[PDB]
Write a protein that binds this ligand. Structure first.
Ligand SMILES: [Mn+2]
Ligand SMILES: [Mn+2]
Length: 378
């Protein structure tokens, strides 16, 4: 390069699930992830963690808008809500007393946790697990998303003594974030999706060709069921106004998300909290949820990898090109997501604050499955 590899690869991570007793024993071999920014501070986020008290692995991509406070928040909190929602009763009790390790994060050095907000965050989680004390995975993911998005709403209202923290809850509730998350326990894949990010299964066909299977539907204006669902959630007189110019109330591209309290709160609460300023065409809120659509897939020996990615990838390529490219990469004919980012974008359309003229933030996780272990459950 004149230095192109240095950039593509600046953020590229990749994790191997450790061998036990000399053998690859998991249905997951490992994953690769990378990000390429188009925005100042990048607005996408990526996360990956292993449940320590329950078996599964969590992976996630989050596409922030109107700042990165909310993608940052959910990129670090959501997995704890999901994890704690999977804990059996007896285990919850343990923790309330004590302390037991919950998640092992697989993060690149550029990913980070919020130092200053840690106490507050633990407190809401704790509050949450206390109430759970007083197990369907699908129904866990759902309540976890909802509960996170709701706590985000409460924390914005409650504010904080610390002027900086008080500011943070607000910046978090007023910016928004998509969320597309995989949970894998053995042969059981669940994909919880909220927004226009996307999980895609790469299937190798018996002739060795590559096929793409969708595990999520983009929650936007192309999505019929979604436009139908928005209308049904409001009086008939709104059917014309709910979605316009392909946007939620003429504004938001993604039709589901965290934060974005502007599209959820009553006008009077937006006013009282105003201590941003503008509401939409806005009669019967809330208009927007963080509640995810959840898909289950039982893994097969054909099922070779899962690509989770924000729309910066997807707007660029056909689903089939993504799965083919990764398909060929993994199979001989480095990091799969660096590769996809390279095709997505010899050619130096990169430099400067004119990038988001030509591209979005791109964040990609490629999980690779262990066909022998998966096939061993067949
Ligand atoms: Mn974004
Ligand atoms: Mn995007």
């Amino acid at each position: 390069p004149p230095q192109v590899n240095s950039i593509l690869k600046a953020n590229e991570y990749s994790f191997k699930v450790p061998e036990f007793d000399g053998k690859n024993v998991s249905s997951v071999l490992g994953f690769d992830s990378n990000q390429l920014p188009a925005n100042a501070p990048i607005e996408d986020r990526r996360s990956a963690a292993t449940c320590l008290q329950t078996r599964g692995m969590l992976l996630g991509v989050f596409d922030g808008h109107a700042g990165c406070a909310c993608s940052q928040a959910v990129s670090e909190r959501l997995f704890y809500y999901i994890a704690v929602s999977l804990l059996p009763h007896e285990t919850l009790l343990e923790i309330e007393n004590a302390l037991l390790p919950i998640l092992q994060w697989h993060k690149h050095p550029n990913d980070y946790f919020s130092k200053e907000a840690s106490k507050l965050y633990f407190n809401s989680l704790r509050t949450y697990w206390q109430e759970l004390i007083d197990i369907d995975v699908k129904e866990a993911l759902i309540n976890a998303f909802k509960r996170l998005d709701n706590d985000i709403s409460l924390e914005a209202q409650v504010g904080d003594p610390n002027s900086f923290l008080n500011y943070l809850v607000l910046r978090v509730a007023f910016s928004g974030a998509t969320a597309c998350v995989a949970h894998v326990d053995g042969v059981d894949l669940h994909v919880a999706n909220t927004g226009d990010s996307r999980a895609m299964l790469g299937v190798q066909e018996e002739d060795g060709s590559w096929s793409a299977v969708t595990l999520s539907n983009d929650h936007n204006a192309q999505n019929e069921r979604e436009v139908e669902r928005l209308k049904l959630e409001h009086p008939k007189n709104e059917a014309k106004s709910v979605v316009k110019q392909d946007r939620l109330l003429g504004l938001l591209m993604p039709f589901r998300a965290f934060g974005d309290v502007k599209f959820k709160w009553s006008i009077d609460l937006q006013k009282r909290v105003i201590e941003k300023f503008i509401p939409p065409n806005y009669y019967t809120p809330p208009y927007l949820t963080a509640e995810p659509e959840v898909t289950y897939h039982r893994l097969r020996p054909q099922d070779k990898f899962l690509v989770l990615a924000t729309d910066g990838l997807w707007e660029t390529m056909h689903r089939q090109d993504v799965v083919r490219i990764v398909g060929e990469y993994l199979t001989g004919m480095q990091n799969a997501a660096t590769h996809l980012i390279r095709h997505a974008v010899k050619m130096l359309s990169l430099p400067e604050e004119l990038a988001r003229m030509y591209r979005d933030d791109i964040t990609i996780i490629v999980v690779q499955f262990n066909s022998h272990v998966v096939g061993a459950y067949q």
